[PDB]
Design an enzyme around this catalytic site. Structure first.
Site, PDB file in Angstrom:
ATOM      1  N   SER A  53      79.960 -56.864  21.235  1.00 37.78           N
ATOM      2  CA  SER A  53      78.823 -55.974  21.391  1.00 37.78           C
ATOM      3  C   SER A  53      79.141 -55.097  22.594  1.00 37.78           C
TER       4      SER A  53
ATOM      5  N   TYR B 187      67.825 -49.821  30.380  1.00 33.84           N
ATOM      6  CA  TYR B 187      66.509 -49.234  30.620  1.00 33.84           C
ATOM      7  C   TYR B 187      66.266 -49.112  32.124  1.00 33.84           C
TER       8      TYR B 187
ATOM      9  N   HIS C 279      67.154 -51.969  26.131  1.00 28.38           N
ATOM     10  CA  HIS C 279      66.822 -52.951  27.157  1.00 28.38           C
ATOM     11  C   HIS C 279      65.390 -52.611  27.541  1.00 28.38           C
TER      12      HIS C 279
ATOM     13  N   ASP D 249      65.496 -54.616  37.657  1.00 21.83           N
ATOM     14  CA  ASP D 249      65.853 -54.497  39.065  1.00 21.83           C
ATOM     15  C   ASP D 249      64.587 -54.031  39.790  1.00 21.83           C
TER      16      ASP D 249
ATOM     17  N   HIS E  40      71.175 -66.112  40.029  1.00 26.86           N
ATOM     18  CA  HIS E  40      70.489 -64.877  40.364  1.00 26.86           C
ATOM     19  C   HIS E  40      70.228 -64.907  41.871  1.00 26.86           C
TER      20      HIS E  40
ATOM     21  N   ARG F 207      63.388 -72.036  30.323  1.00 20.00           N
ATOM     22  CA  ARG F 207      62.012 -71.632  30.061  1.00 20.00           C
ATOM     23  C   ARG F 207      62.037 -70.356  29.235  1.00 20.00           C
ATOM     24  N   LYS F 208      62.864 -69.419  29.683  1.00 14.48           N
ATOM     25  CA  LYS F 208      63.039 -68.128  29.038  1.00 14.48           C
ATOM     26  C   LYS F 208      63.471 -68.317  27.581  1.00 14.48           C
TER      27      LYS F 208
ATOM     28  N   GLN G  64      75.744 -62.072  33.442  1.00 13.59           N
ATOM     29  CA  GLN G  64      76.009 -61.032  34.413  1.00 13.59           C
ATOM     30  C   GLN G  64      77.539 -61.030  34.388  1.00 13.59           C
TER      31      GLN G  64
ATOM     32  N   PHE H 213      78.705 -53.188  43.484  1.00 11.91           N
ATOM     33  CA  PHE H 213      77.746 -53.766  42.552  1.00 11.91           C
ATOM     34  C   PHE H 213      77.852 -55.287  42.641  1.00 11.91           C
TER      35      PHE H 213
ATOM     36  N   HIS I 202      80.347 -59.448  25.280  1.00 11.75           N
ATOM     37  CA  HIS I 202      79.492 -58.281  25.482  1.00 11.75           C
ATOM     38  C   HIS I 202      80.186 -57.435  26.564  1.00 11.75           C
TER      39      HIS I 202
ATOM     40  N   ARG J   4      82.458 -45.620  28.699  1.00  6.28           N
ATOM     41  CA  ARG J   4      83.833 -45.242  28.398  1.00  6.28           C
ATOM     42  C   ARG J   4      84.363 -46.246  27.376  1.00  6.28           C
TER      43      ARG J   4
HETATM   44  C1  LIG Z   1      73.141 -58.247  30.211  1.00  8.92           C
HETATM   45  C2  LIG Z   1      72.236 -57.687  31.361  1.00  8.92           C
HETATM   46  C3  LIG Z   1      71.525 -56.481  31.149  1.00  8.92           C
HETATM   47  C4  LIG Z   1      70.653 -55.921  32.138  1.00  8.92           C
HETATM   48  N1  LIG Z   1      70.030 -54.709  31.819  1.00  8.92           N
HETATM   49  C5  LIG Z   1      69.183 -54.175  32.810  1.00  8.92           C
HETATM   50  C6  LIG Z   1      68.506 -52.913  32.529  1.00  8.92           C
HETATM   51  O1  LIG Z   1      68.577 -52.237  31.496  1.00  8.92           O
HETATM   52  N2  LIG Z   1      67.631 -52.496  33.525  1.00  8.92           N
HETATM   53  C7  LIG Z   1      67.338 -53.147  34.733  1.00  8.92           C
HETATM   54  O2  LIG Z   1      66.453 -52.823  35.509  1.00  8.92           O
HETATM   55  N3  LIG Z   1      67.989 -54.285  34.954  1.00  8.92           N
HETATM   56  C8  LIG Z   1      68.869 -54.781  34.041  1.00  8.92           C
HETATM   57  N4  LIG Z   1      69.546 -56.047  34.329  1.00  8.92           N
HETATM   58  C9  LIG Z   1      69.339 -56.624  35.675  1.00  8.92           C
HETATM   59  C10 LIG Z   1      68.195 -57.563  35.816  1.00  8.92           C
HETATM   60  O3  LIG Z   1      66.960 -57.004  35.314  1.00  8.92           O
HETATM   61  C11 LIG Z   1      68.106 -58.151  37.235  1.00  8.92           C
HETATM   62  O4  LIG Z   1      69.186 -59.081  37.398  1.00  8.92           O
HETATM   63  C12 LIG Z   1      66.707 -58.735  37.572  1.00  8.92           C
HETATM   64  O5  LIG Z   1      66.596 -58.978  38.968  1.00  8.92           O
HETATM   65  C13 LIG Z   1      66.353 -60.014  36.840  1.00  8.92           C
HETATM   66  O6  LIG Z   1      66.092 -59.904  35.442  1.00  8.92           O
HETATM   67  P1  LIG Z   1      66.004 -61.157  34.547  1.00  8.92           P
HETATM   68  O7  LIG Z   1      65.511 -60.741  33.214  1.00  8.92           O
HETATM   69  O8  LIG Z   1      67.233 -61.968  34.673  1.00  8.92           O
HETATM   70  O9  LIG Z   1      64.770 -61.865  35.311  1.00  8.92           O
HETATM   71  P2  LIG Z   1      64.133 -63.308  35.219  1.00  8.92           P
HETATM   72  O10 LIG Z   1      64.809 -64.182  34.222  1.00  8.92           O
HETATM   73  O11 LIG Z   1      62.655 -63.172  35.191  1.00  8.92           O
HETATM   74  O12 LIG Z   1      64.628 -63.792  36.667  1.00  8.92           O
HETATM   75  C14 LIG Z   1      64.595 -63.160  37.984  1.00  8.92           C
HETATM   76  C15 LIG Z   1      64.387 -64.129  39.169  1.00  8.92           C
HETATM   77  O13 LIG Z   1      63.064 -64.726  39.129  1.00  8.92           O
HETATM   78  C16 LIG Z   1      63.228 -66.145  39.102  1.00  8.92           C
HETATM   79  N5  LIG Z   1      62.065 -66.668  38.396  1.00  8.92           N
HETATM   80  C17 LIG Z   1      61.774 -66.730  37.062  1.00  8.92           C
HETATM   81  N6  LIG Z   1      60.594 -67.225  36.794  1.00  8.92           N
HETATM   82  C18 LIG Z   1      60.070 -67.503  38.059  1.00  8.92           C
HETATM   83  C19 LIG Z   1      58.829 -68.007  38.476  1.00  8.92           C
HETATM   84  N7  LIG Z   1      57.850 -68.274  37.597  1.00  8.92           N
HETATM   85  N8  LIG Z   1      58.614 -68.122  39.814  1.00  8.92           N
HETATM   86  C20 LIG Z   1      59.562 -67.757  40.675  1.00  8.92           C
HETATM   87  N9  LIG Z   1      60.766 -67.267  40.399  1.00  8.92           N
HETATM   88  C21 LIG Z   1      60.953 -67.169  39.044  1.00  8.92           C
HETATM   89  C22 LIG Z   1      64.634 -66.461  38.509  1.00  8.92           C
HETATM   90  O14 LIG Z   1      65.243 -67.676  38.883  1.00  8.92           O
HETATM   91  C23 LIG Z   1      65.390 -65.296  39.110  1.00  8.92           C
HETATM   92  O15 LIG Z   1      65.860 -65.511  40.428  1.00  8.92           O
HETATM   93  C24 LIG Z   1      70.504 -56.638  33.386  1.00  8.92           C
HETATM   94  C25 LIG Z   1      71.243 -57.865  33.596  1.00  8.92           C
HETATM   95  C26 LIG Z   1      72.082 -58.393  32.649  1.00  8.92           C
HETATM   96  C27 LIG Z   1      72.876 -59.675  33.076  1.00  8.92           C
HETATM   97  N1  LIG Z   2      71.406 -56.128  38.824  1.00  9.32           N
HETATM   98  C1  LIG Z   2      71.835 -55.575  37.691  1.00  9.32           C
HETATM   99  N2  LIG Z   2      72.829 -56.151  36.982  1.00  9.32           N
HETATM  100  C2  LIG Z   2      73.274 -55.617  35.812  1.00  9.32           C
HETATM  101  C3  LIG Z   2      72.720 -54.432  35.278  1.00  9.32           C
HETATM  102  C4  LIG Z   2      71.690 -53.822  36.006  1.00  9.32           C
HETATM  103  O1  LIG Z   2      71.181 -52.777  35.593  1.00  9.32           O
HETATM  104  N3  LIG Z   2      71.247 -54.389  37.215  1.00  9.32           N
HETATM  105  C5  LIG Z   2      73.248 -53.846  33.956  1.00  9.32           C
HETATM  106  C6  LIG Z   2      74.748 -54.140  33.800  1.00  9.32           C
HETATM  107  C7  LIG Z   2      75.517 -53.390  34.914  1.00  9.32           C
HETATM  108  C8  LIG Z   2      77.035 -53.553  34.804  1.00  9.32           C
HETATM  109  C9  LIG Z   2      77.761 -52.743  35.886  1.00  9.32           C
HETATM  110  C10 LIG Z   2      78.800 -53.116  36.682  1.00  9.32           C
HETATM  111  C11 LIG Z   2      79.295 -52.135  37.542  1.00  9.32           C
HETATM  112  C12 LIG Z   2      78.671 -50.935  37.468  1.00  9.32           C
HETATM  113  C13 LIG Z   2      79.040 -49.684  38.273  1.00  9.32           C
HETATM  114  O2  LIG Z   2      80.027 -49.673  39.010  1.00  9.32           O
HETATM  115  N4  LIG Z   2      78.218 -48.644  38.104  1.00  9.32           N
HETATM  116  C14 LIG Z   2      78.410 -47.344  38.789  1.00  9.32           C
HETATM  117  C15 LIG Z   2      77.395 -46.324  38.263  1.00  9.32           C
HETATM  118  C16 LIG Z   2      77.612 -46.025  36.779  1.00  9.32           C
HETATM  119  C17 LIG Z   2      76.640 -44.945  36.299  1.00  9.32           C
HETATM  120  O3  LIG Z   2      76.894 -43.765  36.629  1.00  9.32           O
HETATM  121  O4  LIG Z   2      75.664 -45.320  35.616  1.00  9.32           O
HETATM  122  C18 LIG Z   2      78.233 -47.490  40.309  1.00  9.32           C
HETATM  123  O5  LIG Z   2      77.677 -48.533  40.720  1.00  9.32           O
HETATM  124  O6  LIG Z   2      78.656 -46.551  41.020  1.00  9.32           O
HETATM  125  S1  LIG Z   2      77.380 -51.038  36.256  1.00  9.32           S
HETATM  126  C19 LIG Z   2      74.943 -55.677  33.932  1.00  9.32           C
HETATM  127  N5  LIG Z   2      74.318 -56.200  35.182  1.00  9.32           N
END
Ligand SMILES: Cc1cc2nc3c(=O)[nH]c(=O)nc-3n(C[C@H](O)[C@H](O)[C@H](O)COP(=O)(O)OP(=O)(O)OC[C@H]3O[C@@H](n4cnc5c(N)ncnc54)[C@H](O)[C@@H]3O)c2cc1C
Ligand SMILES: Nc1nc2c(c(=O)[nH]1)C[C@@H](CCc1ccc(C(=O)N[C@@H](CCC(=O)O)C(=O)O)s1)CN2
Ligand SMILES: Cc1cc2nc3c(=O)[nH]c(=O)nc-3n(C[C@H](O)[C@H](O)[C@H](O)COP(=O)(O)OP(=O)(O)OC[C@H]3O[C@@H](n4cnc5c(N)ncnc54)[C@H](O)[C@@H]3O)c2cc1C
Ligand SMILES: Cc1cc2nc3c(=O)[nH]c(=O)nc-3n(C[C@H](O)[C@H](O)[C@H](O)COP(=O)(O)OP(=O)(O)OC[C@H]3O[C@@H](n4cnc5c(N)ncnc54)[C@H](O)[C@@H]3O)c2cc1C
Ligand SMILES: Cc1cc2nc3c(=O)[nH]c(=O)nc-3n(C[C@H](O)[C@H](O)[C@H](O)COP(=O)(O)OP(=O)(O)OC[C@H]3O[C@@H](n4cnc5c(N)ncnc54)[C@H](O)[C@@H]3O)c2cc1C
Ligand SMILES: Nc1nc2c(c(=O)[nH]1)C[C@@H](CCc1ccc(C(=O)N[C@@H](CCC(=O)O)C(=O)O)s1)CN2
Ligand SMILES: Nc1nc2c(c(=O)[nH]1)C[C@@H](CCc1ccc(C(=O)N[C@@H](CCC(=O)O)C(=O)O)s1)CN2
Ligand SMILES: Nc1nc2c(c(=O)[nH]1)C[C@@H](CCc1ccc(C(=O)N[C@@H](CCC(=O)O)C(=O)O)s1)CN2
Lengths: 287, 287, 288, 271
Positions: free
Chosen positions: B24, B58, B86, B118, B149, B164-165, B176, B216, B266, B272
């Site tokens: 993917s 997203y 997302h 984030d 995390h 839980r999730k 990650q 990052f 994934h 790219r």
């Molecule tokens: C494949 C992938 C794709 C991503 N895509 C995006 C994107 O499009 N946009 C973006 O903004 N970010 C994205 N992220 C980043 C992500 O949103 C961040 O890492 C964020 O801080 C946590 O999201 P999560 O869904 O893992 O959160 P959660 O699973 O909710 O976890 C976040 C933190 O809260 C804690 N937690 C959970 N439940 C509780 C509770 N009830 N009480 C206290 N603590 C709790 C967990 O242990 C953890 O430390 C991506 C990450 C990955 C690995």
């Molecule tokens: N905390 C957090 N974790 C995540 C994501 C996220 O949005 N937030 C999505 C995915 C991000 C994967 C990446 C690894 C390195 C990246 C990178 O170097 N990005 C460029 C920016 C790229 C752009 O122009 O979008 C930078 O940081 O300068 S982007 C997976 N993990």
């Protein structure tokens, strides 16, 4: 997790060898204005890595042989690096050879890769080594074949030839390229068993054009493992993927060889710097 | 010769898995005309590999969120591939989320990567999963963190959160990115020990720009092994060597993971195609 | 060369762990003038390592308990580190507990290790946790038993009791010392598998006096693996070798634990700094 | 135990070092080593000091004591007289070496000369990371074989910290037809600064994790001893698991570390 640790160990070992690896680069006479330009770009790029020496292949036609000498001279002037021309026994009498050798020495070229030479559609390499040593105290390199020279009557005879060759006054042997790492390692051991005391330097061929490498391999008795053939399958029109896959292969190879004690590598650059430069980087050989 | 055989074995195993690997690709909303062009070229290139699905990140700003949807739609029309947007809990009320979810479903988008998001300078991912499942029977993916995390009170709590999730109705977890292969393998085992029944899909980040990847990584608690830092040392102005070294690393990683049973990858493409395409090729995932 | 390769990787990963490790040291109230000198020398030495916190055991003697509170104060002033006193349910009414409890909070003591206590020849730790959190939002640490608490009627029962205790309002658990890494690892997995949300911090006992370690273990239901018993066999009168052997075992232990993701260690220093100081060094925990 | 150990000592140059040495000898002798040896230093004691310690060890413990005999600044005739004297006086095991140059004869020439005099038990040096003066790795291995074929009972390796380096070397030796045991020489490290200077001087590689392990311990002898003991015990554990049944310890005249390492190896006093 076996493979996980083994990999981390290999990687860490490679990082720590930085500054202990000796490298050399092989080039061939350019045949066009475009090829010439590429060559000098490559020479400048790779010269910054401070190779122990660079060499230039020797073909049969007269113009090309005059080319070998001019490029060697050009390399010496431009970089100040030790440049070793390849000299063959093809289309040359012992007298011409002694003359060419005397002239090379007087011109400051004291390292020669002594070869019998590819046969166009008399004496052997050992004869050239002896001839050269009679002219002057040249630093001499010769070819070795981990997978046996296709003309040898036997592996025993081929290995014995190398010994005979080395005994005439050789400083090092450079192997034909290979993709079966174990063949090289076993050969290196057999050389000791044969009483050959020079280092057996692996000749590394970074593959970017598989079709051509396979053809050369098929003509030289070099085995292409099945996994490698599958790795390049379907990439005839994808130069970019071929380069990434080829670099991966070359890098994996020198990493393993390095862990087995190899501290000298000779690269068949095909006049391009990119791949060999990057491979050398992973080896800790940097500007 | 240990490493020699181990390598040949790994290589042969990889060649034989051809056709069993699911992949993917992840993309992000382009921010310029130039970035947009690159994206569609990458989408067309990677679509030929028939990924199980592709996803689009997203962000928070309104325009970008409208961008996510248009690109998802654009991808569906152009390739006919399943595209998963997302969705985060950031700057959104449960009511807006249910509306967005209902509209996604009615529009044929039934796979969502549910995230907390984030935090810009309330509910958690599990809450979003539950919300989404109440709206419709969505195929759902969530994030997992092999190296914990950075906000988790503990590894135990973070692992428990994942459980839980998952319990709320998840089809798979995507990790990650990571460079310490053992951390992923150990985490995968701990997940079983935690009673989590979904596959833990490794998120692979092919590194071409180390400076940015390191930044990052430093913000996400992702460890950069010393050997890797040394491998990119001195390459700030050499994009070509960085790409070859990065591909080598990515390829070595998926080869080892594949041998450990991983059949799903994934890729964080950063829009790219070159690197991910070549990595997939070594995995037997070809046109 | 599998053993060798794995060994290299382990040493390397540990080598780069330097900085992300959290350590705490446990001390006990000295009983002699000599012991005091040693203790403060050890506290000074170990403090330069910036431990997340340090704790002091809690005996049952009235005068000795005054020492517990006292030493905590000294440590607090002297070094400025977070000193968490141990609190037991032995010889104390729920009312007295609240007193010292909030009396501690007013003295800058916000972290307490809540225990039921060793029974000298009604409530449990869980009850003490509940009692403390109401008095104030204390950072609380409790004990966990990888090899099952001696009284527990069952491993599972003991495990559920830990959750009960944790579910009461604790921030971390510290294990009884142990020497079989697997038991700890499996226990840690069973813990998350049981829903316990806090880290199970390993309590490391660097062994220099095997005779006494074996006796404390035989009383606490801690297992002395055969390989370990054989390792110390014949060293009753060789303190130097016991020290090297014991340091080796402890360094080997935290190295495996570290590679398994453990980033927190609690050392039972027995008031001596040399061994714990060295182990921390191998973990990358060093001074300026 | 199936594990055999031997200890190496050097001639003391001061009253203090002499006392340290004899204390170590008494301590380590109780482990019943297969043999002990005493090094030589042309300008750091000479043959008489080496011989003195060997005689003392023999009379005092009754253990087999092998002197390290070099053939530098020594003539074939002198070497013959020397060997004769050693043999007639009970010294039947010699560590034959060319010697650190303060080409003449090589160790292989010394081995031959010695065997002509008497049927000595002979040990020689081997270099897993290649002798610094060797023309090549291939040549160094060939020279080991030549030396072994002269009539050697065993080879003892230069110290090393990269265990794989030793393992790979052992395999190359076997492939080369060298059938005698390649006994790893183990250097327990307490003074890293001194070990590093000796290593850099002998081309012995110090892994990055090791230098990192001794970083910041220049003024902490106690931690260096604990950390160094850990490293050594780990090393011998791995070697042991890899089938190594013989260890030669570079004691630097101190017994504490080597004694403990031997203990972890199951090598204990028979009291
Ligand atoms: C494949 C992938 C794709 C991503 N895509 C995006 C994107 O499009 N946009 C973006 O903004 N970010 C994205 N992220 C980043 C992500 O949103 C961040 O890492 C964020 O801080 C946590 O999201 P999560 O869904 O893992 O959160 P959660 O699973 O909710 O976890 C976040 C933190 O809260 C804690 N937690 C959970 N439940 C509780 C509770 N009830 N009480 C206290 N603590 C709790 C967990 O242990 C953890 O430390 C991506 C990450 C990955 C690995
Ligand atoms: N905390 C957090 N974790 C995540 C994501 C996220 O949005 N937030 C999505 C995915 C991000 C994967 C990446 C690894 C390195 C990246 C990178 O170097 N990005 C460029 C920016 C790229 C752009 O122009 O979008 C930078 O940081 O300068 S982007 C997976 N993990
Ligand atoms: C690093 C390298 C660089 C090269 N550069 C060039 C170049 O610039 N130009 C070019 O033309 N070619 C070059 N070659 C190719 C090479 O010249 C061919 O492989 C050639 O067929 C043999 O050369 P050689 O020096 O190995 O020959 P030799 O060592 O003489 O061996 C060739 C064959 O003769 C056999 N042989 C040797 N002595 C006897 C004997 N007395 N009786 C019978 N059989 C005997 C050997 O076993 C072997 O099969 C190179 C090869 C290498 C590996
Ligand atoms: C890091 C550490 C520090 C310690 N410090 C000290 C100290 O300073 N002073 C001292 O006196 N002792 C100390 N101890 C020892 C400890 O007090 C004893 O092990 C004691 O027997 C149990 O205390 P606990 O807090 O674990 O008790 P609890 O957690 O109350 O458990 C004790 C037993 O009761 C059972 N159980 C728990 N709650 C319930 C319940 N509600 N209903 C039924 N069964 C239940 C358990 O399964 C267990 O068998 C320490 C131990 C550790 C590991
Ligand atoms: C266990 C051990 C104990 C030692 N004890 C001492 C000691 O007490 N005193 C001291 O002074 N030094 C001692 N040394 C150090 C040693 O003397 C040096 O390493 C010295 O430089 C070489 O000695 P060798 O016996 O290994 O010599 P050799 O085996 O002769 O080897 C020396 C070099 O000559 C090469 N060589 C061998 N034969 C030939 C040949 N025919 N032609 C060309 N090259 C050849 C070898 O490949 C090598 O590079 C010891 C080393 C070890 C590992
Ligand atoms: N028999 C033989 N063996 C040799 C060499 C040789 O000249 N003859 C030199 C070196 C040749 C190394 C090469 C491996 C592959 C090569 C290749 O693919 N060459 C291109 C031609 C490159 C050019 O334009 O010169 C081709 O075959 O199409 S060139 C080492 N081995
Ligand atoms: N049941 C129980 N378990 C406990 C503790 C406790 O108080 N009770 C505190 C901690 C005790 C850790 C120790 C392990 C071995 C110890 C030891 O050998 N103590 C010495 C006395 C102290 C000393 O060595 O000076 C002895 O028993 O002779 S003290 C953790 N576990
Ligand atoms: N080239 C060479 N190699 C040799 C030896 C030798 O004499 N020369 C003997 C043995 C030497 C073993 C040692 C490893 C480290 C040593 C060291 O650090 N010695 C300190 C002295 C240590 C002490 O005795 O206090 C020094 O002289 O600087 S001594 C084995 N290998």
């Amino acid at each position: 997790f076996f493979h996980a640790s083994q990999r981390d160990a290999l990687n860490q070992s490679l990082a720590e060898v930085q500054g202990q690896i000796n490298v050399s680069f092989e080039f061939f006479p350019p045949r066009t204005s475009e090829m010439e330009q590429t060559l000098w770009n490559s020479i400048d790029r790779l010269s910054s890595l401070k190779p122990k020496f660079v060499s230039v292949t020797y073909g049969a036609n007269s113009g090309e042989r005059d080319r070998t000498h001019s490029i060697i001279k050009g390399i010496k002037d431009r970089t100040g690096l030790e440049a070793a021309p390849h000299l063959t026994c093809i289309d040359a009498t012992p007298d011409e050879l002694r003359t060419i050798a005397r002239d090379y020495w007087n011109n400051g070229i004291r390292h020669i890769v002594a070869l019998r030479g590819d046969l166009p559609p008399e004496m052997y390499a050992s004869d050239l080594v002896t001839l050269l040593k009679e002219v002057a105290d040249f630093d001499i390199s010769v070819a070795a074949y981990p997978e046996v020279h296709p003309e040898a009557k036997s592996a025993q005879a081929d290995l014995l030839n190398l010994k005979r060759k080395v005994d005439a006054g050789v400083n090092r042997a450079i192997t034909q390229f290979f993709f079966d790492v174990e063949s090289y390692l076993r050969f290196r051991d057999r050389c000791v068993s044969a009483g050959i005391d020079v280092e057996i330097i692996p000749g590394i061929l970074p593959v970017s054009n598989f079709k051509q490498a396979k053809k050369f391999a098929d003509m030289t008795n070099v085995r292409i493992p099945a996994w490698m053939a599958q790795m390049f399958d379907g990439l005839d029109d994808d130069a970019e993927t071929r380069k990434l896959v080829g670099a991966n292969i070359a890098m994996d190879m020198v990493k393993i060889l390095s862990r087995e004690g190899v501290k000298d590598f000779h690269f068949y650059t095909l006049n391009r710097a990119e791949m060999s430069y990057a491979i050398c980087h992973t080896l800790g050989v940097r500007p």
